Amino acid sequence: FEGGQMPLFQRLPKRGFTNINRKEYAVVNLDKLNGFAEGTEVTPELLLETGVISKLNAGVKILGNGKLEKKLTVKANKFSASAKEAVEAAGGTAEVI
Amino acid sequence: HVKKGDKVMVISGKDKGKQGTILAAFPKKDRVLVEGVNMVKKHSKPTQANPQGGISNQEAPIHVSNVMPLDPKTGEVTRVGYKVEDGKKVRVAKKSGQVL
RNA sequence: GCUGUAAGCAAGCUUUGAUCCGGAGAUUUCCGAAUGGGGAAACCCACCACUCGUAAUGGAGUGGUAUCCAUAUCUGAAUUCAUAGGAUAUGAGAAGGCAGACCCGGGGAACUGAAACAUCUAAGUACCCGGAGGAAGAGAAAGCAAAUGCGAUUCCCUGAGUAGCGGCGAGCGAAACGGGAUCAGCCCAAACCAAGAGGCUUGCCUCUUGGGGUUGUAGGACACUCUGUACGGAGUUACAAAGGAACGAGGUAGAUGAAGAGGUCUGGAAAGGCCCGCCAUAGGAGGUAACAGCCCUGUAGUCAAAACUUCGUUCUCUCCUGAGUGGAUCCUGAGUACGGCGGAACACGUGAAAUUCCGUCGGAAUCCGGGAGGACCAUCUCCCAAGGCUAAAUACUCCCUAGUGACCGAUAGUGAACCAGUACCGUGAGGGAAAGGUGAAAAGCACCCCGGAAGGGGAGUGAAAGAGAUCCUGAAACCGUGUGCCUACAAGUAGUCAGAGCCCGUUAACGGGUGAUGGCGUGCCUUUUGUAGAAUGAACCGGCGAGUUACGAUCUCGUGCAAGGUUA
RNA sequence: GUGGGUAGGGGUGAAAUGCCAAUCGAACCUGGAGAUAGCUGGUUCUCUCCGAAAUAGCUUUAGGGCUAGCCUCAAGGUAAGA
RNA sequence: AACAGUGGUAGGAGAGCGUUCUAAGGGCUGUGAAGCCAGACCGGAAGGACUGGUGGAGCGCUUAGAAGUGAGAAUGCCGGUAUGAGUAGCGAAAGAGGGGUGAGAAUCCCCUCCACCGAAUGCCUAAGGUUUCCUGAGGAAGGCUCGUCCGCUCAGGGUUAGU
RNA sequence: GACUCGGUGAAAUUAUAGUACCUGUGAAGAUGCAGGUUACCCGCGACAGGACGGAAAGACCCCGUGGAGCUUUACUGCAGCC
Numbered sequence A: 001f002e003g004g005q006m007p008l009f010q011r012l013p014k015r016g017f018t019n020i021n022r023k024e025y026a027v028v029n030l031d032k033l034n035g036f037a038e039g040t041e042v043t044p045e046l047l048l049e050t051g052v053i054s055k056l057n058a059g060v061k062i063l064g065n066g067k068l069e070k071k072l073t074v075k076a077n078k079f080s081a082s083a084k085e086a087v088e089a090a091g092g093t094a095e096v097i
Numbered sequence B: 001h002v003k004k005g006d007k008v009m010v011i012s013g014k015d016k017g018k019q020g021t022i023l024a025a026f027p028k029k030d031r032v033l034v035e036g037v038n039m040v041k042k043h044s045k046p047t048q049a050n051p052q053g054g055i056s057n058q059e060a061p062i063h064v065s066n067v068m069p070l071d072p073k074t075g076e077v078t079r080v081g082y083k084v085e086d087g088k089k090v091r092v093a094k095k096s097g098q099v100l
Numbered sequence C: 001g002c003u004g005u006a007a008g009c010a011a012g013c014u015u016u017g018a019u020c021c022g023g024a025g026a027u028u029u030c031c032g033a034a035u036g037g038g039g040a041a042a043c044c045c046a047c048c049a050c051u052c053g054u055a056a057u058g059g060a061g062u063g064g065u066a067u068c069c070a071u072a073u074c075u076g077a078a079u080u081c082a083u084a085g086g087a088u089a090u091g092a093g094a095a096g097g098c099a100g101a102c103c104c105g106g107g108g109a110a111c112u113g114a115a116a117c118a119u120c121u122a123a124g125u126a127c128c129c130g131g132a133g134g135a136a137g138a139g140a141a142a143g144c145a146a147a148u149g150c151g152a153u154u155c156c157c158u159g160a161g162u163a164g165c166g167g168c169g170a171g172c173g174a175a176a177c178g179g180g181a182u183c184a185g186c187c188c189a190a191a192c193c194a195a196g197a198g199g200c201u202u203g204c205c206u207c208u209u210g211g212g213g214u215u216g217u218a219g220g221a222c223a224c225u226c227u228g229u230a231c232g233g234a235g236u237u238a239c240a241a242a243g244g245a246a247c248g249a250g251g252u253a254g255a256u257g258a259a260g261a262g263g264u265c266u267g268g269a270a271a272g273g274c275c276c277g278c279c280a281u282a283g284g285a286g287g288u289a290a291c292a293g294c295c296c297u298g299u300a301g302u303c304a305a306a307a308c309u310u311c312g313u314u315c316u317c318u319c320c321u322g323a324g325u326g327g328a329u330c331c332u333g334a335g336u337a338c339g340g341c342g343g344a345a346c347a348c349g350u351g352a353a354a355u356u357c358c359g360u361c362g363g364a365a366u367c368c369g370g371g372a373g374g375a376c377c378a379u380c381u382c383c384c385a386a387g388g389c390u391a392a393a394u395a396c397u398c399c400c401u402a403g404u405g406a407c408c409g410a411u412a413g414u415g416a417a418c419c420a421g422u423a424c425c426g427u428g429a430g431g432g433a434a435a436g437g438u439g440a441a442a443a444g445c446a447c448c449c450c451g452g453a454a455g456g457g458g459a460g461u462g463a464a465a466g467a468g469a470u471c472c473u474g475a476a477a478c479c480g481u482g483u484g485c486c487u488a489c490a491a492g493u494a495g496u497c498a499g500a501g502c503c504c505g506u507u508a509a510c511g512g513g514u515g516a517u518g519g520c521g522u523g524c525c526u527u528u529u530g531u532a533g534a535a536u537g538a539a540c541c542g543g544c545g546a547g548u549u550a551c552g553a554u555c556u557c558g559u560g561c562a563a564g565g566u567u568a
Numbered sequence D: 001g002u003g004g005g006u007a008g009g010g011g012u013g014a015a016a017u018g019c020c021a022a023u024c025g026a027a028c029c030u031g032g033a034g035a036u037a038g039c040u041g042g043u044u045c046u047c048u049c050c051g052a053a054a055u056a057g058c059u060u061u062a063g064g065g066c067u068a069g070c071c072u073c074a075a076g077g078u079a080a081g082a
Numbered sequence E: 001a002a003c004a005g006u007g008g009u010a011g012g013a014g015a016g017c018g019u020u021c022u023a024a025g026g027g028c029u030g031u032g033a034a035g036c037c038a039g040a041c042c043g044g045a046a047g048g049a050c051u052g053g054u055g056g057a058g059c060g061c062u063u064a065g066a067a068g069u070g071a072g073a074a075u076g077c078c079g080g081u082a083u084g085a086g087u088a089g090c091g092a093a094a095g096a097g098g099g100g101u102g103a104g105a106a107u108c109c110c111c112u113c114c115a116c117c118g119a120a121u122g123c124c125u126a127a128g129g130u131u132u133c134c135u136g137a138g139g140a141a142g143g144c145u146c147g148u149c150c151g152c153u154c155a156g157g158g159u160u161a162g163u
Numbered sequence F: 001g002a003c004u005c006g007g008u009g010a011a012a013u014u015a016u017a018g019u020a021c022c023u024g025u026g027a028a029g030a031u032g033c034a035g036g037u038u039a040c041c042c043g044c045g046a047c048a049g050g051a052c053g054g055a056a057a058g059a060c061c062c063c064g065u066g067g068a069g070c071u072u073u074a075c076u077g078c079a080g081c082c
Helices: A030-035 A044-048 A083-089
Strands: A074-076 A094-096 B008-010 B039-043 B055-059
Touching: A083 A094
Parallel strands: A074 A094
Antiparallel strands: B039 B055
């Protein structure tokens, strides 16, 4: 409230909107993938039972905040344009589902 | 559980251990008269009848669970059992198996 | 042993088995839906049959006699048929109530908020009215949903205070996906065929009965191949209704039931201390002259119901075919669906508004069809509305058993522990109290003295009588009676510090009480710039009386685990 | 006098805001209702540590509130502070 | 241990005391529990303890937990008791005297004088009231004072219709 | 009626008060405050100047974003009527 002065949520404009569909390919930090030593076959089903991905909201991207140094036959739905370099220079395949 | 008139000891109380028979029972109040036990002097109005009034020498009756029967044989204070062929639940006195 | 409260007297009754407790009946004046009629509730008056009685009238008993509806049957007006209507009998029809609740439907506000208020909210809340059932409502797709799809509704948790709605403000606020509890699906209608009837111009087409027939990438008819009429299945709760009779287990009454007076002491009384013994599938509770496993009722375990029930199984009984193949064509829900106008319910306030439901106008297709996929159109995916049945999962309690409370202990807990919705208060709808405890039992005070009598003093009763009728405990305000010290030259919010005299000896302390008089000193609280306040509050005394609780959000503090934590 | 009707955003009034059960510019009862109150009264045991303000911007707002202003608790920064 | 501080409303922080109940055992009670009253005792307070007397069956301590957790003020609520105060008031309106009753008489009864209403304070009977009527006893309570008396209390009795 | 005796016997109020006067200071008009002066202790019968005496959370004024009743070419609307 503001006494009777027209308060701050009314002196300020709307900013619409929210999507009819917004998808959150989330989350894979890249240094989560050093949970495989050595390991391959990085799939969300092999990540669901290992708790790196808590709940998979319509797919996952792989986000390049990290490094390896490990090869991984990565089977993921989406990738950053940096995760096609760390997985790639390590020699592991970076298969987009 | 005791009836008029079985042979009766006094478990506890002021008269702890005397015996006597039963003048009357009062089963709704759970309380039994014994001769000469809880002998209490009572003052009475001059009646109609008798004209004497005076002091009487009655007994106020006794609660039932300060009263036991006796074995006829040992003369012991004994607890009560039952189940008697052709006896209509006649009391087995413990230290088996005397009736009544 | 019994004749309830009730504590006493008379009269009686009972192991030729009484008092009590259950089952099954019978009895059940009158009012009350009241129902023959009137009625101002608890009363009057009838009539029709039948009985009792008088010579008869009068009088008395026994049933029947409302209203609506339905099944029939006679009659049957203006008016001819015929009908309205009238008369009669049959209906173990239904009107009333109440568990102040929960669930549908019709109506349906305001106050409050939005800091005003009128859109909104409050709120489809309360309240009124109709429904019944122990539950109701909904329900087997014109459903979600957009894949490798799910498969009737309901309820719970998430989803999430998200998508949204809103003078977009107050506030309102879903669904679907995910996981459980519960878990069953089916009949009608329509064509086709059989039997009646009923008319038309034979023909033709129009109502009932009996089969058949229950649908979606379509099903049925129809036709053609099979398949049964059983021994297979079902069944009274849907699925179609409907009967019995046996086996077992609960319930409305029970019955059995272990172990010590252990001794001593204190005592009015052991159930308590000490020293001891046992039982225990029983140490649940409650009495017991005081705190009992063993004294009693019982408890734990077992076992029983003549009669009523409630439930589960069987037998009896009852009832019943399912499929392929094609589509020459006939069906698949009409004044209905949708559409205009006007409203309401959907979280959606008339909107880009899907959807449902009403009023009023219009008004289609009927498989080559049609509907949903949040205005609208094509493609694509589901799915057949315009008919109906559906237990359980759910919400509930005036209730009835058994039980549990970090619930209450009489100014509390229901208003009512007490003859409470009583007394009183109101014309009346209505408001609505206060009031617990002798003792272990009446042993409730025989007798004497005073007194008219209550009321006492002795005497006994019991542990207490100071316990004796408000009857355990008894405080304070108050009201007394004795008093030790002060007071009749004194001006005082009454106290404090000083202080001699006088009087007492202590939770043994630089004691206690009164303090002649002196120095200081204008109550407590609220509200105020400021109150001794001539500003408010309080007569006093005692009791009751106000910051939480439920659910979330935030910060510190603590604990576990740590890019892994919690599970509804 | 008897007998009897007219019922509360109504009745009734040879009218005054009168009367409607001792109540009238809207009768009493029960509920929504624990309506709301920026307004008044009340806010129950002790000790210590610190310790305000009655100013401003606004405000259907002036005896209300909301940010600042001054207070307090805790943690960092560090000697900024005067 | 050294040095400094230590008034205080609104308010923030910290530490405590209380009461009731539950949970561990441990410990007091008929050789007397709780509560009550007394008292010159101890800690910083809220507060505790001890001896006496009453009281006649329950109760504390520690350690945690729960909270219908604390009274002086609400023109609060209920109950009791004051103050005013032996004060206002004792509800229009003539009795007096003798006797009797009884414990007690102005107030009760009887008698005799006197006085008031007499188009009402007469009788009769509606509205209502539901025994208030009569007798025989009492008398605490209601009678605005007594009170042998009553419309009070008890115990009986009491209302007869073809007009 | 009042006064007195005998019977019976309340209420409003009320922080505790053993309650003098005047001049001053004070919340600006004292019994209780300072200074001064009077005043043996306790009753009864009266009067009413004071205790801002009781009685009624002021009727007057003003505030409440309080309410009611009423009025109209105040707003938006309802019935009624056309």
